[PDB]
């Protein structure tokens, strides 16, 4: 990333922060991953 900042010394770029496992961002994508695989209705995804 910093190497790309060396190749692109602030010329043209769009910066978006990407924290790992932010949360609310974990839930929906966990549901998406739960769409393909078989999952019961008696499981709590929140705490996990």
């Amino acid at each position: 990333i910093l190497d790309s900042a060396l190749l692109r010394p602030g010329r043209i770029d769009r910066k978006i922060e990407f924290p790992p496992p932010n949360e609310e961002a974990r839930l929906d994508i966990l549901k998406i991953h739960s769409r393909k695989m078989n999952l019961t209705r008696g499981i709590n995804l929140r705490k996990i």
């Binding site: 692109r8 010394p9 602030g10 010329r11």
Partner: protein, 298 residues
């Protein structure tokens, strides 16, 4: 028709593609191939033998290899002197043919600003009617030899070399280039214009042996020819009387043709903001600020 169609035996099934080396006055030529086989046979029809330009690929056979044919595949005083140098074999001859000089050793162009601005400025002036060749940048000089012979075929034209700059190999290939450009075994062929930035970096062996005629230091930025170039680029464009070219061309430093084309393009683009077909001075400077800040930021 019959005598024309009776040669189908040589051009038929027993046929191959070879490479000719040279043409001999003894009427038996010499060809070559992957294993470098040579076959001397009396010549036949369909061959030019003159404009053929030997050293290319030709037609061979599984037979005796009789060839049935071939297959093709303040510089005013300075600029007037170089004018009378490179444009000497050109229009307005009467100042030449009366006596004549013809020193085809080429010249050397350089200057403090560099960046090929003045070099391309002088090079584009000869691009009216001519065949132009641009070489930028500096195993051996094999490609240099190829350029030399292709410029030997292109001899009735103007050759312009731009941006002339392990380490011991550079020196010996510079000596080789000097020897090849000197025309030891060959007479005057084509005018070669040497163009660089700093003359201090170049060795003295590139001055005396290379050019026997003249070399001139660069006295100033020469806003004149640059004003002419800007006038050429803005000829199709429109401008008002309140726009001064002097301060504009004085402010700009180290720009190329693509650069000025870019800043003019963005000048018109920024003039499209107000939907005006006329570009002002302040809009030109404001547009120039974009590129000026762009390259200096990185």
């Amino acid at each position: 028709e019959e005598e024309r169609s009776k040669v189908d035996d040589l051009r038929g099934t027993p046929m191959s593609v070879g490479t000719l080396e040279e043409i001999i006055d003894d009427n038996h030529a010499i060809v070559s191939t992957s294993v470098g086989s040579e076959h001397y046979v009396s010549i036949l029809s369909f061959v030019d033998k003159d404009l053929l330009e030997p050293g290319c690929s030709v037609l061979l056979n599984h037979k005796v290899h009789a060839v049935i044919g071939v297959l093709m595949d303040g510089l005013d005083n300075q600029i007037q002197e170089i004018k009378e140098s490179v444009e000497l074999p050109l229009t307005h001859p009467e100042y030449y043919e009366e006596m004549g000089i013809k020193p085809p050793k080429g010249v050397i162009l350089y200057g403090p600003p560099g960046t090929g601005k003045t070099l391309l400025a002088k090079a584009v002036a000869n691009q009216t009617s001519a065949t132009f060749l641009r070489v930028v940048g500096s195993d051996g000089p094999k490609l240099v030899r190829e350029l030399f012979r292709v410029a030997e075929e292109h001899a009735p034209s103007i050759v312009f070399i731009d941006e002339i700059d392990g380490e011991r190999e550079i020196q010996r290939t510079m000596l080789e280039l000097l020897n090849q450009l000197d025309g030891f075994d060959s007479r005057g062929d084509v005018k070669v214009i040497m163009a660089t930035n700093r003359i201090e970096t170049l060795d003295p062996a590139l001055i005396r042996p290379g050019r026997i005629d003249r070399k001139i230091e660069f006295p100033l930025p020469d806003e004149k020819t640059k004003k002419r170039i800007f006038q050429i680029h803005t000829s199709r464009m429109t401008l008002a009387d309140d726009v001064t070219l002097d301060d504009l061309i004085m402010a700009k430093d180290d720009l190329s043709g693509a650069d000025i084309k870019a800043i003019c393009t963005e000048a018109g683009l920024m003039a499209l903001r107000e939907r005006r077909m006329k570009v002002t001075n302040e809009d030109f400077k404001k547009s120039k600020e974009n590129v000026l800040y762009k390259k200096q930021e990185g």
